[PDB]
Specification:
The structure is a homohexamer of 188-residue chains. A three-stranded antiparallel sheet of chain A has the order 1-3-2, covered by helices on one side. Helix content of chain A is 67%, strand content 5%. The radius of gyration of chain A is 21 Å and the shape is elongated. In chain A, strand 2 (137-140) and strand 3 form a beta hairpin. The first copy, chain A, is mainly α and 188 residues long. The first copy, chain A, starts with a helix and ends with a helix. Chains in contact: A-B, A-F, B-C, C-D, D-E, E-F. The interface between D and E is medium-sized, with 30 and 30 residues. Chains A, B, C, D, E, F: GO terms for molecular function: calcium ion binding; gap junction channel activity; gap junction channel activity involved in cell communication by electrical coupling; identical protein binding. Chains A, B, C, D, E, F: Residues 13-19 are cytoplasmic. Chains A, B, C, D, E, F: It is found in: Cell membrane; Cell junction, Gap junction.
Chain lengths: 188, 188, 188, 188, 188, 188
Amino acid sequence: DWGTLQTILGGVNKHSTSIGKIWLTVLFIFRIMILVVAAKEVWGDEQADFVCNTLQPGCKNVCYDHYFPISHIRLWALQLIFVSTPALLVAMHVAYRRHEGSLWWTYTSSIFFRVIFEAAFMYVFYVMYDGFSMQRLVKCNAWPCPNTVDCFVSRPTEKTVFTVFMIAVSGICILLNVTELCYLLIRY
Amino acid sequence: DWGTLQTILGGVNKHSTSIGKIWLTVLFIFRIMILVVAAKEVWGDEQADFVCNTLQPGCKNVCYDHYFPISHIRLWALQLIFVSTPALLVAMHVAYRRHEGSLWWTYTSSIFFRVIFEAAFMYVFYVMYDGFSMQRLVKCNAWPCPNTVDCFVSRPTEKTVFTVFMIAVSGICILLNVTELCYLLIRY
Amino acid sequence: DWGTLQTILGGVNKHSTSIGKIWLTVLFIFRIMILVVAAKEVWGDEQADFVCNTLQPGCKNVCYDHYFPISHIRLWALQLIFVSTPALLVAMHVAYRRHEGSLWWTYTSSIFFRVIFEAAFMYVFYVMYDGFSMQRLVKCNAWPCPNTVDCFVSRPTEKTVFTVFMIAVSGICILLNVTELCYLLIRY
Amino acid sequence: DWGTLQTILGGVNKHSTSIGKIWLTVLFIFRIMILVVAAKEVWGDEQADFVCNTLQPGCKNVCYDHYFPISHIRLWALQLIFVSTPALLVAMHVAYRRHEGSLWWTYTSSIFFRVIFEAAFMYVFYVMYDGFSMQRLVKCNAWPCPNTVDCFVSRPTEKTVFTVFMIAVSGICILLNVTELCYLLIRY
Amino acid sequence: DWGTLQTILGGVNKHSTSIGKIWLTVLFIFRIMILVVAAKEVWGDEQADFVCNTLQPGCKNVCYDHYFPISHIRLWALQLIFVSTPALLVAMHVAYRRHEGSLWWTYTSSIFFRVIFEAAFMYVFYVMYDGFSMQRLVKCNAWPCPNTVDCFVSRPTEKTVFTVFMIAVSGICILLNVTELCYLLIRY
Amino acid sequence: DWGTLQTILGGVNKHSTSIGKIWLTVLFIFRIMILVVAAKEVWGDEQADFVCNTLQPGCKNVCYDHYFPISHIRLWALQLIFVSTPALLVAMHVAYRRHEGSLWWTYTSSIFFRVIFEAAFMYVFYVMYDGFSMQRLVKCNAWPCPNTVDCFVSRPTEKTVFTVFMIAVSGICILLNVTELCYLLIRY
């Protein structure tokens, strides 16, 4: 929903650098549009259409929870909020400044927190789901499922396409932030 | 939804102290974003996907009600409203003041109510759910369920992750308020 | 939804008295937040999860209608609209005045209608549901149910918590209005 | 949704008469609030929870259509739009006037169309549903239902309460318009 | 949703003629209100409640598709967008003009496209659905349905009422545009 | 939702050329209206109403995923975002310019990226779905479906109508951009 975000993005459109003015902000808007407009309804029936070949009551609940401890959309929602906080803090700091070394140290710290935040979430996506490709079939042997029970995921291919798309864009944002640090580092 | 909250948070952005200007407000916004964007849809199917291994009609309703007297999202919604009231009252009080001891006593009372409100809700979350970890299996023996009936919870792991996240952030907000009282106390 | 309610509450924030400026308005906002944010989704599955132990077609419809002639959320929605009308009328009356006895009589009449409106709805909640506690089991013998049929309510405990919360806040608003009348009565 | 209706109602708040300024506008807002906030979700499951005691395929569709040619909420939605048109036309006519007999004839014609529009819809509600009370049981013998089939309505009591409430308020609006005509008629 | 449409309709409220200022714009708003507020939820369960008397898998999908190649609400949505384009183009053309023969030719062409657009869609509604009345029973013999299968439509009467209402209003808009051409033609 | 898009489209309404001012912007708005108002609810039950003639658990999930790797609405959502980025970048570039060769090279590059972006997505729609016509019947032999299983698509005809409509409009936008390049090329 639009609401009044134009004031926020327009307000933070200033107080930036050569690449922070445009390139780092359009990509952040780019990820929000993908998550809200298209990606949010792909995971709508993640559990409703999760089908297991068994008659054991409660086996469906435990198997979905075992292989999906947290949904992909929830992780992406958390990642965007975390990376948007250092930018927000420095955005209102220059307003107080207009109301240099400490400001320079404040700015160079925000770009350092964004790199590790994106790297951490990108690392979580790999260890938790053993890769960026979602499989059609998952084998589940958790209690109370008898022996091993075959379960099938809903829309595995479409979720894979968005998973690769989100990771690739986040990797690009890391490169821009790294070049931003190098740009300021040489200037001293 | 954005609507016009920017005027509220922007309006209450002033009339604050060294840490109340930024740190105590971003965390309050942080909890709202988590509850609305991500956490609210995790508890969407709390009762729909609640499965019990029985054929007794009405046993599902009583067991879910017994182990979930009030949903976690409802408690968090109540907590945010209560803690936001003392800040709102003092926010409009300084507007009347611009329209010192009594103002100082008014301000130091708001930070005292927020500490006990957050402590009370944090205490309720512990006694009601015997900890911050949600179990996959719950054993239910309430009428009319015959003997003991096994029931299974929906998304126990994902709800645990958000439960720990909300508690940890609320604990941080307590520390900031405590330091705020100590900051004013030494000044006298 | 925010929309433009800030203009309404901000507009009616003026034209008030010592307690009408803040205390009587925050509680009115307090009840709206509880009803919309949390309480509205508790009654979402009031009839969907209503379970009766019978095979008679149509017995479920008649029993739910017999014990729930009108939902609690609908009654609270009606109550808020009725109590907000006398305040709205006097809010736009002073605008015409700025555009004393008659104004004083107009103001003292609004606080009189709000007391009886809240008392009436509070009385309806008692006679209709024989108390503020909702039971897990209801015994139904209306046609076409054969003999007496046991039916089970959805989320009886959680609805009880909000029922007590709404009644208690409404009782507090009665006391404030009563003191408002006494405050003006002594002044003459 | 609020959106920008405050400009519309605030704009049409002027250009009125002694009772058109307040009394005739608050009641019109009153009906909108009832229809949107509370009444619209009562008829949500009108057909989903419509249950017939038969095994004949397609008998449910024909019986619901026979006894409910048009839903109550749809009729109320049509009625509000029709009655709001004469007021809207004269609202923008005085703006052209500021940009007397013809204006007086224009104004007195709007109150004449509103009386017959409300009377017509009130008459339709009576002949179509043979009264303002909804029954729990309806007997249906339309093809392809064999012989007579018993069907049960969803929430008959709650729909009756709102049906009486809407009719009573509409009857009050007729009286105000009638007095408005008499008020101008004596003045000549 | 309101949003900012008041600026659009208010902006295009000017730059019109004797009947284009009011009559042709209120009817266009009239159709939008009917389609959004009331008519859009009537077709909500068009396929969910479509019932066929057969046990053949996939027969329900083919029969609904055969008799409903495109929903009525989708056709009305397309019609409103098409007819609103010539008005929009001339609305921004006069803004460039303020920034006569060509303008006169531009204006008289917009009213010519609106007549044929409404006539075309009105013709499509007739040939596709063989009239403006929807039947309760449809006989389907498409593959893989064996022989002829009886299927039943959801809410046939209510959809008929709105179908006649939309056609009648669109016919009125044709007459206004025709008189607009005749009004300018005699003037030369 | 309107929100504040009028400022965006109104803001980018300037800074354009003879055809970029109106023709290229109304078509872009045209596609958004079709996708949001009408086309988005056609694909609502794409998987819910997907029916296969088999008793093998999990065969429905794999067959829908095999023939629909990504939904048509998701592809259109991606296409609109990509084509809207070059226009957005040059829209804010002229604001910096007002705050010629490089500007001319910047403008002529945006129209070059839009041609290849639309051509690429149009090519994807052809190879992935072997044409712009959707079939009622799909034959599926992927594991674990035994032998070949017949499955039926929901609303194949209505989706075909919108598929042709979206492709045709996108083809028109390519022609306008091509003429835009030729218009500037001759001028040099």
